[PDB]
Amino acid sequence: ASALPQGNMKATATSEHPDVGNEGLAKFAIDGKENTIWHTKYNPVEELPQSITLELGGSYEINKFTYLPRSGAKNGNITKYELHVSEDGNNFRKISEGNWDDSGSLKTLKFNSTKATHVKLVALEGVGGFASAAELNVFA
Ligand SMILES: CC(=O)N[C@@H]1[C@@H](O)[C@@H](O)[C@@H](CO)O[C@H]1O
Ligand SMILES: [Ca+2]
Ligand code: NA
Questions:
Q1: Where on the phi/psi map is residue 79: left (φ > 0), alpha (ψ -120 to 50), or beta?
Q2: Which of 1, 55, 69, 87 is the most buried (most CB within 10 A)?
Q3: Number of the ligand closest to the Cα of 24
Q4: What are the binding positions for Ca(2+) 2 in this chain (predicted)?
Q5: How far is CA 131 from CA 54, 81, 126, in A?
Q6: CA angle 18, 21, 24 (to 5 degrees)
Q7: Which parts are annotated binding residues for beta-D-galactose?
C-alpha cells in the first residue's frame, strides 16, 4: 500500500482558521507542505470536538492513515482522536480511536483494509483546546 495522491482529494473541516500564512485552511493539511497546517478557527475559538474530512477522489480499500502534527509549536497537536470512514460522504462510522502524545512525531494508524470514499479525523482533545494538522495521508 502507498499514499493516495493528495491532489485528487478535497479537504473540508468543521472549523478552520482563515489563511493567515501557513494556517489554517483545511486544504493546508493535504498540500504536501510540512510547514502549512489546518488549524481550527480561533478569535473566537471554536471548541473541540472538531473534525477534518478528506474526500479521497474515489472509493478505495484503505489500510493506513498518517497524521503529521505542526512543527516548532504545539497548539492543536491532537491527543485524543477518532478516525471515521464513509462510503457515501454522509454516513460515517468509527474504525479507530485512541491517544497520541502531544509531541511532533508522525502518528500512524493501521487498520484492516476497509472501503472508503471519505476519511474523517475527529480531534476530541488537543493542545490548547485547538486541533491542527500539517499533513494527512491515506494508504490503499
Ligand atoms: C507559533 C504558534 O504557536 N502559533 C499559534 C497559532 O497556531 C494558534 O494556535 C494561536 C491560537 O490563539 O496561537 C498562536 O501562537
Ligand atoms: Ca501542510
Ligand atoms: Na475529557
A1: alpha
A2: 69
A3: 1
A4: 28, 31, 33, 36, 134-135
A5: 16, 10, 5
A6: 40
A7: 23, 70, 75
> Strand pairing of 78-86 and 38-39?
unpaired
Cell 510547514 belongs to 35
> Which three cell numbers mark 132?
491542527
Method of elucidation: X-ray
Q: Which residues define the annotated binding site?
A: 23, 28, 31, 33, 36, 39, 70, 75, 134-135
Q: Is 75 in the pocket of ligand 1 (CB under 6 A)?
A: yes
Ligand 1 contact, 39 CB (< 6 A): yes
Query: What's the rounded Cα separation, in Å, for the pair 76 and 140?
Result: 27
